[PDB]
Enzyme design. Sequence first.
Site: not given
Ligand SMILES: Nc1ncnc2c1ncn2[C@@H]1O[C@H](COP(=O)(O)CP(=O)(O)OP(=O)(O)O)[C@@H](O)[C@H]1O
Ligand SMILES: Nc1ncnc2c1ncn2[C@@H]1O[C@H](COP(=O)(O)CP(=O)(O)OP(=O)(O)O)[C@@H](O)[C@H]1O
Ligand SMILES: [Mg+2]
Ligand SMILES: [Mg+2]
Ligand SMILES: [Mg+2]
Length: 345
Positions: A69, A71, A121, A186-187, A200, A240, A248, A297
């Site tokens: 994946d 991004d 993505d 939003d998701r 970040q 993440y 942390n 979540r």
């Molecule tokens: N592909 C992505 N790229 C950048 N930021 C992402 C991301 N996916 C998630 N995030 C960040 O992670 C935060 C939490 O995302 P999610 O875990 O998917 C719950 P959400 O989208 O906030 O829906 P919800 O309010 O119904 O729980 C998002 O608000 C965003 O800041």
């Molecule tokens: N719960 C969350 N809180 C804050 N930021 C989040 C988040 N979930 C996702 N994001 C942001 O969106 C980016 C893309 O999320 P994802 O692709 O779903 C996991 P990732 O960190 O890229 O690892 P992976 O795709 O290698 O498993 C994350 O790296 C993070 O910057």
């Molecule tokens: Mg992704």
């Molecule tokens: Mg620390």
């Molecule tokens: Mg990713």
Amino acid sequence: MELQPQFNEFLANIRPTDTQKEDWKSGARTLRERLKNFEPLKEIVVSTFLQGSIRRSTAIRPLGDKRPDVDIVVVTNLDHTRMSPTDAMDLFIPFLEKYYPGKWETQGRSFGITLSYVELDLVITAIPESGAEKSHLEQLYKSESVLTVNSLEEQTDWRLNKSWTPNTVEDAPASEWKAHPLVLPDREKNEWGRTHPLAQIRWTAEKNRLCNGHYINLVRAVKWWRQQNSEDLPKYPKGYPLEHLIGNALDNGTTSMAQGLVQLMDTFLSRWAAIYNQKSKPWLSDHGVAEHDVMARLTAEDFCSFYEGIASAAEIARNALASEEPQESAQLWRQLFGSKFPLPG
Ligand SMILES: Nc1ncnc2c1ncn2[C@@H]1O[C@H](COP(=O)(O)CP(=O)(O)OP(=O)(O)O)[C@@H](O)[C@H]1O
Ligand SMILES: Nc1ncnc2c1ncn2[C@@H]1O[C@H](COP(=O)(O)CP(=O)(O)OP(=O)(O)O)[C@@H](O)[C@H]1O
Ligand SMILES: [Mg+2]
Ligand SMILES: [Mg+2]
Ligand SMILES: [Mg+2]
Ligand SMILES: [Mg+2]
């Protein structure tokens, strides 16, 4: 023993491959150029940039055949008070049909693009600011600091600063970027939420410097432990939220990966002992958007099962570090990480 050469070889074994890396760098460059030259979107797209675990060098190699994946953020100048997330995403369907027919799909809040060796993505975002503030942010998103497709591991000289240039300058003052997240879909619903990927990335680069280069390696090592022991661990946390827990738990000043592992596991266990005994889970501020709980979540049941997994792993890690014989120490480390951690010669 610390076995630093063995940890280095282990890390080389769990990083994404050079084939994957060049595929996603070329894929990102090509997507960015195609967007740049696509007439209907030329005045809308501000920036196309690499983000996520790939950009922060916190990604591990997928098992077997699987594509990593990768991004990508598309920054637009759309007015998020007048257009919904789906309005913004709708704009990109003709582009995807023209340049990626048969290779793209809508995946809820993002677009998946299947390349030869990686999966892009793509998330469509907007800048909530207006006027001069908006112009300053657009200048940052158009800078080499944002547009570089090299990951943190490849440029330790990287800073979040529109004046940074690749070495062939510090991070900008926080007042210029810290309080300025993007909005993204939003998701699961058609509403804008906040995300600050640049903050970040910068936080991760700085933590890595504070920990003498061991932080991003420790993130990948703990992800690999979680994958290797997945049968005995809860499904979540992963990805993440797992990375955030590691960042942390780790203290500043890490001197080796073995020391850092034992320290971060010990600290995790002591810091969350009360929360675990309360059958709860911590509320942890996102480094990008402070008011967001990265664990929002995650269920309490999964957090507490994960805490039990860390406790069991910490006993092993302590023994591996304390061991005074290279073979026995490497055997204990391999109890944690599996066969990709090598035995010493
Ligand atoms: N592909 C992505 N790229 C950048 N930021 C992402 C991301 N996916 C998630 N995030 C960040 O992670 C935060 C939490 O995302 P999610 O875990 O998917 C719950 P959400 O989208 O906030 O829906 P919800 O309010 O119904 O729980 C998002 O608000 C965003 O800041
Ligand atoms: N719960 C969350 N809180 C804050 N930021 C989040 C988040 N979930 C996702 N994001 C942001 O969106 C980016 C893309 O999320 P994802 O692709 O779903 C996991 P990732 O960190 O890229 O690892 P992976 O795709 O290698 O498993 C994350 O790296 C993070 O910057
Ligand atoms: Mg992704
Ligand atoms: Mg620390
Ligand atoms: Mg990713
Ligand atoms: Mg949410």
